[PDB]
């Protein structure tokens, strides 16, 4: 029973830490690819203009 209780303690602590870190990752997410896509359409439009010229 002591083993089970301590294991549950560890499980709860690990769940807390993993959820916290993954939520931090989610918060940091998407800025890079948003700006990346913006730059990509900008460059593609540049290429289209140059080709038309």
């Amino acid at each position: 029973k002591q083993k089970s209780d301590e294991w549950a303690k560890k499980v709860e602590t690990c769940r807390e830490q993993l959820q916290e870190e993954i939520d931090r990752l989610t918060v940091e997410k998407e800025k890079k690819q948003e700006e990346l896509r913006e730059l990509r359409e900008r460059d593609q439009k540049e290429q289209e203009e140059k080709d038309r010229r």
Partner: peptide, 26 residues
Amino acid sequence: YDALMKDQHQKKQEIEEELAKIIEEV
């Protein structure tokens, strides 16, 4: 514990993949 910890590991790695190298490309 093991099952949900492993699931957390895979989805943490998924978010890591989603964010990671995109900084270098930007």
